[PDB]
């Protein structure tokens, strides 16, 4: 199975033990590591961070002792702006310039492929997205025609039904992509005004779901039936949780909230907590297993956070294997306990290793 893991270039700036650099990654942990994110300037793919060239090398160095490890560079990301991506993909000239600039850039920096993270095409860009993927793959095939190891092309896609229906032509793009990472998390925003797990495996209590489509199982099934081959589908599993600030004594699923949770010490983003930060949070907290959804939430004081742990990722892997999917995708390596000192056990990347062991099990 494929174990696609993301590394974010901004995790380096986190205070203390939160700072994560590529060299802190286990070269034998994943089968694919994706660097996030590359920018696009003057219609050319380009670096984002001032020291990306250095970090690129730091990441690719991992391949020296592990020749089977593949690496990809992701372009886009939530903070990229679908608007900019649209202008480039819709304009015939800009699209060509961009596509042509990718192979040289990837070979120059030691990458094995490109990951498209356009979040997200609009109803207006559905076809453009298809064309972009189709032509990019063409260029990759051409660039390797002489006899090179062809560059890989993947895409991180939304797991939301509304976005999927308006942005993607699953059947068409599935043919050109080497693999699709479905982002099966972020299913329950603080805006919804109630507590909810952002990455449940199944819908669960039919009574307590704000919507039947907001769960991992529905997204996987839906995409499969839309025409994405199981052998090309990689299921996303989060190593971070979504938090809320409770508004009353109620602490169950669907309880009243006043907004996102208090920012984590290292990630410093209201509504988000890295797994290592959750392990701290767990001290003195109560953990509940959501029956039906197969995932846990933890609550303490006026805080509540839905996340994934060793037990739940194991179940999710069991699920993807039963569905004969290509494997799992992890977002992100730097949100797992990479130091291995927060969740005790001294084990590094506890959630990602749990996923790896589960994929090899049976
Ligand atoms: C079911 C449904 O459609 N719900 C909608 C939500 O999907 C949507 O929320 C966005 O969901 C995206 C995935 O579909 C998120 O993008 C990926 O996932 C991570 C984590 O959420 C993103 O965030 C990371 O990267 C940004 C920079 O780009 C960084 O600033 C953040 O700190 C970082 N977050 C964490 C915790 O690591 C990535 O950009 C991206 N990764 C990949 C694989 O490409 C997106 O972040 C998320 N938006 C937000 C801000 O929550 C919401 C949006 O309103 O709408 C629902 O309807
Ligand atoms: C990614 O590339 C874009 C170029 O397309 C950069 O955006 C430009 O930023 C400068 C300075 O902030 C502005 O003067 C330009 O108007 C922007 N170009 C436009 C119109 O898109 C962007 O800064 C790059 N990202 C990073 C952080 O390096």
Swiss-Prot record:
Gene Ontology terms: cellular component: cytoplasm; endoplasmic reticulum; extracellular exosome; extracellular matrix; extracellular region; extracellular space; perinuclear region of cytoplasm; specific granule lumen
**Which keywords does UniProt give here?**
Antimicrobial, Apoptosis, Asthma, Cytoplasm, Disulfide bond, Endoplasmic reticulum, Glycoprotein, Inflammatory response, Lectin, Schizophrenia, Secreted, Signal
Question: Tissue range of expression?
Answer: Present in activated macrophages, articular chondrocytes, synovial cells as well as in liver. Very low or undetectable expression in non-inflammatory colon. Undetectable in muscle tissues, lung, pancreas, mononuclear cells, or fibroblasts.
Give the record's family classification. Belongs to the glycosyl hydrolase 18 family.
**Record's keyword annotation contains Endoplasmic reticulum:** yes
- In its UniProt entry, what is this protein called? Chitinase-3-like protein 1
Residue ranges of domain GH18 in the record: 1-362
Q: Which GO terms describe its biological process?
A: activation of NF-kappaB-inducing kinase activity; apoptotic process; carbohydrate metabolic process; cartilage development; cellular response to tumor necrosis factor; chitin catabolic process; inflammatory response; lung development
**What Gene3D superfamilies does this protein's entry cite?**
3.10.50.10, Glycosidases
Q: What is its main location?
A: secreted
A molecular function (GO) term: extracellular matrix structural constituent
Q: Which domain of life is it from?
A: Eukaryota
Disulfide pairs? 5-30, 279-343
Entry-linked PANTHER family: CHITINASE, CHITINASE-3-LIKE PROTEIN 1
Q: How does it assemble?
A: Monomer.
Q: Which SUPFAM superfamilies does this one have? A: (Trans)glycosidases, Chitinase insertion domain
Residues with glycosylation annotation: 39
Entries under InterPro entries matching the protein: Chitinase_II/V-like_cat, Chitinase_insertion_sf, Glyco_hydro18_cat, Glycoside_hydrolase_SF, Glycosyl_Hydrlase_18
Q: Does the keyword Endoplasmic reticulum apply?
A: yes
Induction remarks: Up-regulated in colon under several inflammatory conditions. Down-regulated by hyperoxia in bronchial epithelial cells.
Q: Which SMART domains match?
A: Glyco_18
List the gene name. CHI3L1
Disease link: Asthma-related traits 7: Asthma-related traits include clinical symptoms of asthma, such as coughing, wheezing, dyspnea, bronchial hyperresponsiveness as assessed by methacholine challenge test, serum IgE levels, atopy and atopic dermatitis. Schizophrenia: A complex, multifactorial psychotic disorder or group of disorders characterized by disturbances in the form and content of thought (e.g. delusions, hallucinations), in mood (e.g. inappropriate affect), in sense of self and relationship to the external world (e.g. loss of ego boundaries, withdrawal), and in behavior (e.g bizarre or apparently purposeless behavior). Although it affects emotions, it is distinguished from mood disorders in which such disturbances are primary.
Question: Region labeled Important for AKT1 activation and IL8 production — which residues?
Answer: 303-317
């Amino acid at each position: 199975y494929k174990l696609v893991c993301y590394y974010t270039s901004w995790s380096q700036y986190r205070e203390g033990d939160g700072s994560c650099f590529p060299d802190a990654l286990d070269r034998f942990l994943c089968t694919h590591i994706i660097y996030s994110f590359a920018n696009i300037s003057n219609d050319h793919i380009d670096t984002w961070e001032w020291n990306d060239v250095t970090l690129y090398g730091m990441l690719n160095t991992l391949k020296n002792r592990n020749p089977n490890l593949k690496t990809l560079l992701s372009v886009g990301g939530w903070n990229f702006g679908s608007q900019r991506f649209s202008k480039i993909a819709s304009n015939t000239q800009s699209r060509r310039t961009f596509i042509k600039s990718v192979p040289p850039f990837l070979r120059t920096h030691g990458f094995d492929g490109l990951d498209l993270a356009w979040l997200y095409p609009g109803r207006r860009d559905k076809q453009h997205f298809t064309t972009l993927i189709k032509e990019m793959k063409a260029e990759f095939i051409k660039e390797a025609q002489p006899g090179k190891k062809q560059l890989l092309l993947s895409a991180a896609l939304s797991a939301g039904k509304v976005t999927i229906d308006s942005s993607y032509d699953i059947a068409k793009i599935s043919q050109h992509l080497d693999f699709i990472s479905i982002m099966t998390y972020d299913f329950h925003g603080a805006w919804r005004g109630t507590t909810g797990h952002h990455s449940p495996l199944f819908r669960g209590q039919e009574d307590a779901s704000p919507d039947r489509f907001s769960n991992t199982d529905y997204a996987v099934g839906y995409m499969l039936r839309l025409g994405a081959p199981a052998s090309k589908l990689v299921m996303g599993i989060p190593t971070f949780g979504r938090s809320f600030t409770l508004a009353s004594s109620e602490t169950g699923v669907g309880a009243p909230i006043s907004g996102p949770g208090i920012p984590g010490r290292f990630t410093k983003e209201a509504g988000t907590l890295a797994y290592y930060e959750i392990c701290d949070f767990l001290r003195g907290a109560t953990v509940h297993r959501i029956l039906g959804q197969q995932v846990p939430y933890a609550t303490k004081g006026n805080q509540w956070v839905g996340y994934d742990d060793q037990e739940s990722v194991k179940s999710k892997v069991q699920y993807l294997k039963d569905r004969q999917l290509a494997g799992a995708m992890v977002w992100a390596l730097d949100l797992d306990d990479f130091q291995g000192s927060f969740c005790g056990q001294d084990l590094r990347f506890p959630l990602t290793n749990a996923i790896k062991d589960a994929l090899a099990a049976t």
